[PDB]
Amino acid sequence: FPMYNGRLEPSLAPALIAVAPIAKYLATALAKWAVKQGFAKLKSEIFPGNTPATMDKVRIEVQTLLDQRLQDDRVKILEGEYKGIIDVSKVFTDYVNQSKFETGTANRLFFDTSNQLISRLPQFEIAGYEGVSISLFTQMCTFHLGLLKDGILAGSDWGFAPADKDALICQFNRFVNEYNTRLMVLYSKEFGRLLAKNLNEALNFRNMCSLYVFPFSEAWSLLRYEGTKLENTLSLWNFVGESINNISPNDWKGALYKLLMGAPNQRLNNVKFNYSYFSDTQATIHRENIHGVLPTYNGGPTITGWIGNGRFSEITKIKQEITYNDVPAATRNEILTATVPTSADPFFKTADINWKYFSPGLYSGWNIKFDDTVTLKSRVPSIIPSNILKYDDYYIRAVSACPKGVSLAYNHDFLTLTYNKLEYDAPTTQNIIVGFSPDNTKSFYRSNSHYLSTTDDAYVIPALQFSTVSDRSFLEDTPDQATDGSIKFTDTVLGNEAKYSIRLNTGFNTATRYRLIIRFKAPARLAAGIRVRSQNSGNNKLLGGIPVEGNSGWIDYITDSFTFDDLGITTSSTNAFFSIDSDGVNASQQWYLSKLILVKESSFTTQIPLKPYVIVRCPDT
Amino acid sequence: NNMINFPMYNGRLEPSLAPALIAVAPIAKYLATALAKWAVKQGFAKLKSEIFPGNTPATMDKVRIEVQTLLDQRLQDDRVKILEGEYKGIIDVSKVFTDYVNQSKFETGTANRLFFDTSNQLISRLPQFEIAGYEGVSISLFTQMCTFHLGLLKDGILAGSDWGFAPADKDALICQFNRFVNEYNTRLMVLYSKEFGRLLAKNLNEALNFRNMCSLYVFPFSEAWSLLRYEGTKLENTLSLWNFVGESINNISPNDWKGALYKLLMGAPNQRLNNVKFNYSYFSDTQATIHRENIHGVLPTYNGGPTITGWIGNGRFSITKIKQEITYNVPAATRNEILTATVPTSADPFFKTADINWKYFSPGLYSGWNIKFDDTVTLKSRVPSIIPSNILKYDDYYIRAVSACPKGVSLAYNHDFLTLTYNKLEYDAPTTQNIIVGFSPDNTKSFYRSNSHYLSTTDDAYVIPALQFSTVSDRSFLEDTPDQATDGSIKFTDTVLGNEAKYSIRLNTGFNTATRYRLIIRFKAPARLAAGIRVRSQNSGNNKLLGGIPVEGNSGWIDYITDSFTFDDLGITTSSTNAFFSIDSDGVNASQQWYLSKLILVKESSFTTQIPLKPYVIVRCPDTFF
């Protein structure tokens, strides 16, 4: 049975899922919002033609991808909630889209739609079914936040006094964080449940959220502004091997996900497998096993080690043939190696890794193949089915594994980005995990630098796509950021910094005025704060000194306007950098770095404020 | 297996002379005073009274017998009387010039002639101290003679018209000082490399003994030659002393020493010792006649990074400890234990003295080890006989590092990967069978205890050695540059990313933050750097550039003096705990690999460049041609 990622039917391409047009429109609306029309166009994508057809298509896709189904009664309930949302949203849309309308009536019909979603939203936080309902709950919160943004920008045009306008801004800032928290509650409940049930199943749920959920939670954090870029750099993970369960979310956060990422800023160079073959004297037993996986990436500052072991329970390969007189008659322990080819595209695209245990138990072998190069064909006398691991518009960035037979709760404080060797010893792994990264990241991982074009209104620099980083820095899984993670700075005495190499493509307008948006989470007050700099061949320019007073949520800091002529960066500048540094932090002052966003000053604008305009404070009870 | 039962002192029967009581110590203590404030027209008179006190060769005779005793090398009797006559010639001519200038009034044209009678007397008699085949003993003598001549030229330069030197005659002396300060240094390293290279192939313990002598008798003065053209600096020596205990190791190349062994001995050059682990194995036979102890590896762990240290030798048992007792009908007792020597946690967290000894007995049945630091016994030999004491100790010195040399393997592998950071500093070997102890002078206790350079407003100059850093970039190596009177330099080789190194600095309570200072950077950049070398200061986000050094390429060490500044301009106060001094550059290829020796913080009021690099009047220096 030719399998596709363990399934008998090939999965739908990521660029063709039902939420793709919604995500493509949000990318356009985040670059330039249509005043008093953004909600009408968003409604046309979430409910096309005033039908729940997209929400039905989203449901059946996620139900097929997760193998989880909603009850028949709950489906007809959601159908009624959809009709209620569609009916009330169309009435408000048709009335404001006239040549002349009474602003007092549009205000009434607005609150009929605004409060229709607030009261019907918990119907999508389905208990015991949040694995499927998280993708539906994601669109309803996008539908309501889009309504609140158009209501703020309309104001008097829709019957909102300056005090009514600030009440909507207060709801926006509350719901942009409440919907995010309620989204992570549905995610953690299901991802935590599946980590203890089946690791391959837990990865499959995270892959679904990386395409149906997390791109839109990032759009929420960008819905405040105009002129940024919606970018998703999350990775997809396929699991091949024996089942692994009873994984806790703490083990994933502080160990397993760190081993899977490997060197988060480097491409794969070669991966090594601890392979052992066993055959009995009657030629009836054939058992192949993978005891360890050693991924070597294209550079530092991360040092990788064995996941599992490289031990033969330095020798490259050892064969053995034994003859007895009435136990192994043939024994082969070999360190296999799959090498990434040196070319203009130094990445693996597809993989054919499969593991099959036969019913009597005598046969159990592995197949390893990347692109068209066969690393291991099973020595089992029978053929092992093909298991194509691939995603369209995705490439293989990392190949790792999960330690088997050991607890994943050890050495969490020492699985850092630098200094310490990124490894986790185990008797065996018997599994191979492949990380697929989207093609939009292929430019950085090929050249180890961020090339900038003057025709782009915004560029997103993920935190994990760095050049160097300080010691005592960790990797934090922040999938709600539409990225593969964040950096957790924990150095106590010396400073905490991280540099990002930048290059200017030929023909770049070095005179255009840019701004830098820094997304970070600093929970405690920092006396010296956080500094943003740029280093080009000795010309160290300070772009901003972020005042840190303490906040539990993510904070976007927008530096003052600047140009690359002020920074001394040209086309031939091969030593340009962006630096984010701070002083030593204690346990409470440990802060996180999400991403850097370079926007044009002409196109960037903060349409929704963090604080109301007229009223002193948001309404309190 | 020697039949002499004596309490040994570093392998010798008699305790060695204290480092501060050696014969060249008064010469070194005067040079440190002259570099802080040079006595015009008297610097050579006072230097002559220390090298030749009372117009006698008594000091040079004491220096000779001390180095000959320490090195166990003896100059030929004929060659001693030769140097005796050469001393008399130098004493006679220098006394005539000194007595004539030290009178009430003297004719300046006469003091000009008697100056070159003494100058050309040293230039002609100097090759008599470059004795071929005896460079081990002669290097201590050749060092003082160059100190005698370089101090003579400096006094003549600053005198000028007082000793009959026209502005053209003054430039002629400046061109000689600039030539001899590099020619004498090159000729000095020729004598050192010939002998330290010979003994590395002969006996490692003997080669370390020679380097210990040069660290006290030679290299303190080569550094004084580099500081001789200034006034207001500090003459500091931070070289370490290395004692060897164990079986003989020979056939070591200078390349094996430069790119491997010396890195293993230093361990973490910016940290103090925390604990040392030894791979110990005991063996006894069923006849209760054989008792063999072995040290198969040494694992030194220091107080921090960024250097990651590993095993020198191995930690394998060929588990912390395993005891075996076997009965047969010929190993009957086998103990494989990883011993540990932990530096105490106190206000002075350093070992002072050690008692490490290894004795192989004549029949071959007994061979054990004794390991003891301070009053804590790490290992008492289980050999039935007592092993003599071997006190490793230098007054005014403390134990900074404890390492070993890999035995049974070549030291020419993995040189490109024995770096300061990233890669684990280790060298696998079947056995070491030796323990090497590193003694650092007490002047470095302040840094290695606090991991920071505390500055006092009462000091006219402070020396920051390159190896006493807080952080350093990747692909940075350790270069053994003993002519800098330090434990080495930093070789920056990172090709793509930048090359930087930070130095943590603190201000003692009562420091005057308004006083003006300057920074002196010594570096050897053989190729031109487009972006050059940048000197900065980082204090809690306040990055101040102190200077951008233009680098165009030079084969020698270059001293760059930044513009004057104050700690008020840098925002550094007494309570500033995150202050740093940065030395960054861009990526360098193979040819552009540069070195960093040290940083010298001097007060602007006390610092002056008294001898220039270029002459004043003449456009170019006169050459040696006809």
Residue numbers in the entry:
A (entry chain B): 17 to 329, 340 to 352, 361 to 655
B (entry chain A): 12 to 329, 341 to 351, 361 to 657
Sentences from the paper on this structure:
Cry11Aa and Cry11Ba are the two most potent toxins produced by mosquitocidal Bacillus thuringiensis subsp. israelensis and jegathesan, respectively. Cyt1Aa, Cry11Aa, and co-crystallized Cry4Aa and Cry4Ba. These are produced during sporulation and are remarkably stable in a variety of conditions, but dissolve after ingestion under the high alkaline pH levels characteristic of the larval mosquito midgut.
We sought to characterize the conformational changes that ensue pH elevation, preceding dissolution of the crystals in the mosquito larvae gut. As the crystals are naturally labile at pH 11, we aimed at collecting data from crystals soaked at slightly lower pH than 11, hypothesizing that early conformational changes would show but the crystal packing still hold. In the case of Cry11Ba, 2.65 Å diffraction was preserved up to pH 10.4. Detailed analysis of structural changes at the side chain level was yet prevented by the non-isomorphism of the “pH6.5” and “pH10.4” datasets. A 1 % unit-cell contraction, and hence tighter crystal packing, was observed in the “pH10.4” crystals in comparison to the “pH6.5” crystals. However, because a higher glycerol concentration was used for injection of Cry11Ba crystals at pH 10.4, we cannot exclude that unit cell contraction might be caused by crystal dehydration. In the case of Cry11Aa we could not collect data, while in the case of Cry11Ba, we obtained a non-isomorphous structure which, while showing possible inter-domain rearrangements, did not inform on specific side chain rearrangements.
